[PDB]
Structures are given as structure tokens and as C-alpha cells.
Amino acid sequence: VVYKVPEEQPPNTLIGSLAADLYKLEVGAPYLRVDGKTGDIFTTETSIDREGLRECQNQLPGDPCILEFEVSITDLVQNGSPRLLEGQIEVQDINDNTPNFASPVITLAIPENTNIGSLFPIPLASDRDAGPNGVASYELQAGPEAQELFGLQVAEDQEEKQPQLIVMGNLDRERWDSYDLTIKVQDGGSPPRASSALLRVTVLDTNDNAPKFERPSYEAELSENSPIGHSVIQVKANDSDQGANAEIEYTFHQAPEVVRRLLRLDRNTGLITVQGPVDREDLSTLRFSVLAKDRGTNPKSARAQVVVTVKDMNDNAPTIEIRGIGLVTHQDGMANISEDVAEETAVALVQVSDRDEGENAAVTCVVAGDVPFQLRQASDSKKKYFLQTTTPLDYEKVKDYTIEIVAVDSGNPPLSSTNSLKVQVVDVN
Amino acid sequence: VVYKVPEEQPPNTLIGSLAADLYKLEVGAPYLRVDGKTGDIFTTETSIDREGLRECQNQLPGDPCILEFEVSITDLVQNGSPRLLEGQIEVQDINDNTPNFASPVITLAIPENTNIGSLFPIPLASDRDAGPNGVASYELQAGPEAQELFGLQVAEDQEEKQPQLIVMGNLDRERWDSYDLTIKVQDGGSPPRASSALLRVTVLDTNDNAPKFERPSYEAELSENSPIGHSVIQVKANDSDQGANAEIEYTFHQAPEVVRRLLRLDRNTGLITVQGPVDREDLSTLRFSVLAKDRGTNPKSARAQVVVTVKDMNDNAPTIEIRGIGLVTHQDGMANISEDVAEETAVALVQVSDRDEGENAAVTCVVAGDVPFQLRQASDSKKKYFLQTTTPLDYEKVKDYTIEIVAVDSGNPPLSSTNSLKVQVVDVN
Ligand SMILES: [Ca+2]
Ligand SMILES: [Ca+2]
Ligand SMILES: [Ca+2]
Ligand SMILES: [Ca+2]
Ligand SMILES: [Ca+2]
Ligand SMILES: [Ca+2]
Ligand SMILES: [Ca+2]
Ligand SMILES: [Ca+2]
Ligand SMILES: [Ca+2]
Ligand SMILES: [Ca+2]
Ligand SMILES: [Ca+2]
Ligand SMILES: [Ca+2]
Ligand SMILES: [Ca+2]
Ligand SMILES: [Ca+2]
Ligand SMILES: [Ca+2]
Ligand SMILES: [Ca+2]
Ligand SMILES: [Ca+2]
Ligand SMILES: [Ca+2]
Ligand SMILES: [Ca+2]
Ligand SMILES: [Ca+2]
Ligand SMILES: [Ca+2]
Ligand SMILES: [Ca+2]
Numbered sequence A, B: 001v002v003y004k005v006p007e008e009q010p011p012n013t014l015i016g017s018l019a020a021d022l023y024k025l026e027v028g029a030p031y032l033r034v035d036g037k038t039g040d041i042f043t044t045e046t047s048i049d050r051e052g053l054r055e056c057q058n059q060l061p062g063d064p065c066i067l068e069f070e071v072s073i074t075d076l077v078q079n080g081s082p083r084l085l086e087g088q089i090e091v092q093d094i095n096d097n098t099p100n101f102a103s104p105v106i107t108l109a110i111p112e113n114t115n116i117g118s119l120f121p122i123p124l125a126s127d128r129d130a131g132p133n134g135v136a137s138y139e140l141q142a143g144p145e146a147q148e149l150f151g152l153q154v155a156e157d158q159e160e161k162q163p164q165l166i167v168m169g170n171l172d173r174e175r176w177d178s179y180d181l182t183i184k185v186q187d188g189g190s191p192p193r194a195s196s197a198l199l200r201v202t203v204l205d206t207n208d209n210a211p212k213f214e215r216p217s218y219e220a221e222l223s224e225n226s227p228i229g230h231s232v233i234q235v236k237a238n239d240s241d242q243g244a245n246a247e248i249e250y251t252f253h254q255a256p257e258v259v260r261r262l263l264r265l266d267r268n269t270g271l272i273t274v275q276g277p278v279d280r281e282d283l284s285t286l287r288f289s290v291l292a293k294d295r296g297t298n299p300k301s302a303r304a305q306v307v308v309t310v311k312d313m314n315d316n317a318p319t320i321e322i323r324g325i326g327l328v329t330h331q332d333g334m335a336n337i338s339e340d341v342a343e344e345t346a347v348a349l350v351q352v353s354d355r356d357e358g359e360n361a362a363v364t365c366v367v368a369g370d371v372p373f374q375l376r377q378a379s380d381s382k383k384k385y386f387l388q389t390t391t392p393l394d395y396e397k398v399k400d401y402t403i404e405i406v407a408v409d410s411g412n413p414p415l416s417s418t419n420s421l422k423v424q425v426v427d428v429n
Helices: A257-262 B257-262
Strands: A005-006 A013-014 A023-027 A032-035 A039-042 A065-073 A083-092 A105-111 A120-121 A133-141 A148-157 A162-167 A178-187 A194-204 A215-224 A231-234 A248-252 A262-266 A271-274 A285-294 A301-311 A319-323 A334-336 A347-355 A364-367 A373-377 A381-390 A399-408 A418-422 B002-006 B014-016 B024-028 B032-035 B040-043 B065-073 B083-092 B105-111 B119-121 B135-141 B149-153 B162-167 B180-187 B194-204 B217-223 B229-234 B248-252 B263-265 B270-273 B285-294 B302-311 B319-323 B334-335 B348-353 B365-369 B371-379 B382-389 B402-410 B417-424
Touching: A023 A032, A065 A418, A105 A162, A120 B402, A148 A347, A215 A231, A248 B263, A257 A262, A257 A285, A257 B217, A262 A285, A262 B365, A271 A319, A301 A381, A347 A373, A347 A418, A364 A373, A364 A381, A364 B024, A373 A399, A399 B334, A418 B002, B002 B248, B024 B032, B105 B162, B105 B371, B135 B149, B149 B180, B229 B302, B257 B263, B257 B285, B263 B285, B319 B402, B348 B417, B365 B371, B365 B382, B371 B402
Parallel strands: A005 A083, A105 A194, A215 A301, A334 A418, B002 B083, B105 B194, B217 B302, B334 B417
Antiparallel strands: A013 A039, A023 A065, A032 A039, A065 A083, A120 A162, A133 A178, A148 A162, A178 A194, A231 A271, A248 A285, A262 A271, A285 A301, A319 A347, A347 A381, A364 A399, A373 A381, A399 A418, B014 B040, B024 B065, B032 B040, B065 B083, B119 B162, B135 B180, B149 B162, B180 B194, B229 B270, B248 B285, B263 B270, B285 B302, B319 B348, B348 B382, B365 B402, B371 B382, B402 B417
């Protein structure tokens, strides 16, 4: 028959004697002792430990822990052969075990901007005791700031208490990214046993920030004809997110072929260098946008206008255009003017121009040898001149006039150009 | 002096005559014609196109487009040498160009759950005309559903109109992930010219969904001693997100060494196979959780309890334990019982047990040769027997009793065990 006895009781505690009937202990050997003539049965210097017994290991909750034993009634005035009695001692549980977390530091990663109400599981504490003497409650201990951000809930759904962090306010990683709470587990023994763990919440990053350029808009001056590799400007943007969410790539946004041909933009450095032949005479300003884009899964981006002013070099010689006026008309660079026409009548029209700018296009223009023609301003960097006679002409020694015009810049080095006009005359009586 | 003339006017339009004073056209050659004796000046079969002229290419807004020309006054009763007049014709702009998007399909990616108010840039339309005859307005045309989700704003900040989509309601990719709007660009000419583009918004995924198991909880039966590779159960979770945000990895959540040793869980298939020697006698149930975790940047997850019931095989032979009772006591497997002791006095206590379950542990037990001992039930799968004498004993032909006990299962195949006891007697007068 049965016997209810608390575990871990001190040696020689009476567990009972026979409500039935030499009494000898055949089975139960380390844990029990019997006395003969009485049938009374006590604990020993090996204590019955409800969590220690082999028999009571993987038991489902509510199944008693039963230690089995046999004693043999072996006297009846030395008459009978023995009768044995197969007893059962049901070991009662005392609260001799503390509830424990697997690790004393517990580490939760909660994303930024997680919706209020969101639940996150906390590792279960466990307790080797049974029923009421096992896990009873979880308690969240937090600083004022954190008290308002994190709650604690327990789900009794699994029929085993699963504790959960509730997020209750907005988390922002860029404001604050680590919270220290304590989680305390207590059992339902009297007195209770209790255990604590450090519960860190780390706020995981989300890509909730776009790059921003250091300046809204960028300018730079760049010399025409700069060598390949010449540094033009460096753009830079910043991003307040973490890792790849703040890693940035620079690419041309709106940028026509003409610009892409001349300028190279490094994805990583945002440094713009020369890559082709810059020519103020083809393009005097490079206008384009740069795109700064993060390496988030759904990248965010920003755009910046850049204006590169192209600066003049004196790389163009002046042009001398020699054409007719009124009735006097050139053919294949020669002109028919008849002997005996008024002094300072105009034989040709001379236009002078320079494709460069400022000084580099400021042109002086003048006539070569000893020939009886000069230039008169007719109308800077485009000058129009009458090419007119200095003297009267007779067919004396003439039809041999090659007039040679020379023009020069104010560049450095200065550039020169020359063009000529043949005038054939006609004799008059 | 100047002259204001609209572009693309029909040949022979009068652009004026001399408020000043043979008149001859020296410069301006394809586009203008003059008549002599009058000084009156008209357009030709080559039309002045304000967007076509070389002179008027990369002009900043508000700088007139000036076509330059020269005519020479070359008669004064055939007295003077010629005077030239360097004229300027300022070409007025008409609205002869339509505003255009670079592509007629424009493609915006807006993330799911983007905060209401968020702005997203729409590519600029451009228009080769000038001032009021260029881009005036942008218009967003959308279906009822979309009208409420997307607004349109223009920023006049850059001093060039930058249009922007405003998100005005929640987008959910899992509800709907493609919207067709039309964007219409109109200029400020009378009549206006206008152009449209298809503006697709595609709603980009965010990892806003956690995996869910097909079942909350899983059971399976598994035979003890199953071969390596035997399929146990397959767990499966689903995730309503896109690509990696719904790609799932299965790993043990809470799972003790003992289980991890026996069971293998494929990260990709969620199939659990046998990997070690399952032994109902060591562990009769495998209890563990499985974690399903997505491959999002900040993974979300779900847990499922699994219970594997381990099923018995008859892989254990019965045990025969032979021990003393009362005063009769065994030493080194032999026992001292004296000749002349009552018929059916008990020489030993025989306990029989089988580590298996049900039939596989149901034990029949019996005595071997012709020896004057039998077994009596003393007290299934643990049976206790008195080993008692059948006859009286005299030292006639004795001290030579080797009693052999045999026990068998009800398994398949059945298993057998044997143990023996020597009894030495003592002669009495
Ligand atoms: Ca204990
Ligand atoms: Ca406890
Ligand atoms: Ca206990
Ligand atoms: Ca943030
Ligand atoms: Ca921190
Ligand atoms: Ca970012
Ligand atoms: Ca962030
Ligand atoms: Ca040049
Ligand atoms: Ca020059
Ligand atoms: Ca130059
Ligand atoms: Ca002559
Ligand atoms: Ca036009
Ligand atoms: Ca227009
Ligand atoms: Ca126009
Ligand atoms: Ca969604
Ligand atoms: Ca779609
Ligand atoms: Ca997901
Ligand atoms: Ca989603
Ligand atoms: Ca086994
Ligand atoms: Ca068996
Ligand atoms: Ca078995
Ligand atoms: Ca005898």
C-alpha cells in the first residue's frame, strides 16, 4: 500500500508503520530502513530527492513520483513461509529549486519604428520543481525612459507561460539604440525563489533616412583643355542610417552625352575628374545633376545640381574674312578695281574674329608691306574694316597688288593669322 | 539698329525699312532679302527658326535671340564711298514646340507603408520654346482608387518646376502592387501644347510579414532504431512577402543535445530525418521547437512545437533477478538451505522485468529440468515470484541443486533470458 513522504527530509524521519498485520527490507535499499517486530519504516543518510530519482525523470506534469520498495514478513512463531508486501512511497515535492534562465544575459533585437503593440518572445525560465513550486510569474524592471517603451505580457496559450516584450512607443535607432531591462522570474513556493536576467533590447536599423548632400548645389571652375584625370570637384552626401543603409553611391542623374563624355564620376568617392577634351568653344558650361543613393534594399536617394564653368584658353587663332561691298565684288580671292578711282575708295570689306574670349579674342589687325591700302574701322572681338586706297591709282605700275592682312590676339602665347586679296586694275585713257 | 520679328513667318514678310537715311545685303544671307532704292527688308524661303539658329543655342533664360546682318549704302549720286549699317534682328518666340517627357512610360518605385506626405520626384518634361511658351503645368490623371493614394505637387524652389508624387494613403504590396496614373504636361502658350506619359507606380516590398507554420504544433510517430536518413516529419511555414523577405530557413529553436544528436533538420526543406540511434529506452518522446525565419535584412520568425513519439521495438531481453528473502540469503549466486524443511518453503525471491513495452515486455517465466522447486506469483512486465520447494528434502542425494530459471517475451522475434541458483543443503539426523 501507499505512503506520502516529503523529499529531502532529515535522516530517520518516520514515514510510517503497518496499518496491516521479523519485518525485513528486501527492496528500496539506499533510501529506506525498517525495524523488525514493529513494521515501522524511516528515511536514511541518503535523502530521497524528487528531482534526483531515476524513476521520476521524464514525467508529464501531474504524474506522482513513486519510489517502490518491498519488505518481507518472515515470522509467525516460525510457522509460515514468508508473505511479502510490495509498497509504494509517493514523494511529495518541496520548493528546493530556483527558476533559472538559460543565460543571465538575454539579447533582443527589435527593429526601429516597430508598430506599437508588437510582441517579442523572451526565453522561458525553467524550474526543476513541480506544479505550484515551479515558474509562477515574470516581472519586467526598467528605468523610467524604458518603462514607457516596453511592457511585459505572458501567453498562457501553450499551457506553459511564454513571456513577451510589448513595444509601446516608437523606437528610433538614430536617437537611441540600446536599452537595459531586467527580467525577473519567480516561482509559486512559500517562500518564493527568484532569479533575474539582464534583458538587452538592441534597436535594429531600418533604412528610414535618405542621403543629404553637404551643399544643395555645387559650382566649380575648370580650365578648357585640362589633362585627363584633372580633379574637377568632389560631391559628398551623408546618411544617418547604419551599414549599407548609409553606404552611398554617386552616379549622374540628368546628364547629357556631351557631359558624360568629358566627366567621370567615381561611384564611391563622388570625385569628378576629366575624361575627355574640354572645349570652352563647344561648351562653356557643364550643367548636370548628381544622384546620391544608399545601398538599402529599397535605396533612398538625393540629387544635387552641379555647374562647371569652363574657362578660356587662347587655343584659337583669329580669322580674317575678306569679302566685297556694293559693286566691288571678289572672285576666287581676287578683285577688279579700275585705275583712276578716288583716293580712299574702299576695295574690300574685312571682318576679323576670334573664337576665344576676353583678351584671348581681342584682335589687332593691320596691313603688311608697302602697298597704297589701309584699314578703317567701319562698325570688340569682332571688328569690321573698310580696306581703302591711300593714293590715286594709274596703270603706270599696277595690276600687281597682293594685299596681305595680318591679325593677332592678346593671348599668351599670342596667335596670328594672315589672309590676302589680289587687286587687278584696268587702265583708263 | 534693332528689329523685332517673330520666327517661322511665311516668306516675304516685311520686317521693316529705314527710319535711317543702292541698299545691298552683305551679311545675313540665307534668311533676309533687301530691295535697293527703298532700304526695305524681308524674310525668305529659309525661315528664321528661333530653336534652329546656331547663335541661339545654350542661352540663359531671358537673353534675346539676335540674328546679325549687314547692309551697305552704296549710292549718293555716285559720290561717296559706301557707309555700312550693322543691324540686329531680335527673333520673337512663337509656341511651335510641344513639352515632352524623355520617355512616354515613367516608372516609380514606392515602398510599402511609406508615410503619408512622402514626396517622390517625377522626371521633368522639357520644351524647346522660351519663357511663357515653355512648361506651365503638370496634371495627374488617375482612376478613383488611385486618386485617393497619390497627389501631385510642384516645387518652384529650383526656379525650374520639379513635379512630385505625394503618397496620401497606405500602400500594401500584399493587397495591390501596381498603379497606372497618367502625368500630363502643358505649356503656357495660347493655344497650349500638351503631352502625356504613363506613370506607373510599383509598390516595393518591405519585410512586414512573419512566417506562419501550416500547423501551430506538429506530432509524429517514429520507430525506435529507425535507419539513418529515415524521414520523421516535414515542417513548413509560409510568408506573404517577396523574394528574400519570404525565403525561409528552418533551425532548431529549443532543442536539447539528446534530440540534436538523433534528428537532422534541413534549413531549406524543413524535413526532419534520423541522424543517430533512436532508443525508446533512453528517450520515449522527442520534444523540441522549430524556428522558421525569413531571409529579410531584419529577419522575422515563428516557432512551432514538435512532439515525436518513439515507438517500441523488442530489442531487450528480459532480466531475471534472483535474491534472498528473510533469513535465507544468497552468497555469490549460491544459497544454504538445510535438508528437512517444510514442503513449499521458499528458497529465493525471483524478480523478472523487461526494459521494453506492452507485448515486448510481457514475460513468461519458468523452471528448467526435473528439480523439486517451482515459482509462485508473490505480488505486468515486472513479476515477483517465490522460488519454493515441491517436495521434502533429505541429504539422501542432494547439495547438488542447480536451479535454472528461463524467461521469455511476447515480442517478435521473442527474446529469452536465463539465470540460475545453486542450493547447498545441510544433513539433519
Ligand atoms: Ca530536491
Ligand atoms: Ca522552485
Ligand atoms: Ca523539489
Ligand atoms: Ca530612425
Ligand atoms: Ca548602443
Ligand atoms: Ca539611408
Ligand atoms: Ca535608421
Ligand atoms: Ca577650344
Ligand atoms: Ca584667340
Ligand atoms: Ca578658347
Ligand atoms: Ca593709264
Ligand atoms: Ca521654331
Ligand atoms: Ca511650347
Ligand atoms: Ca519657338
Ligand atoms: Ca504589407
Ligand atoms: Ca502588379
Ligand atoms: Ca517576411
Ligand atoms: Ca511585404
Ligand atoms: Ca532499445
Ligand atoms: Ca523485450
Ligand atoms: Ca524497445
Ligand atoms: Ca539425512
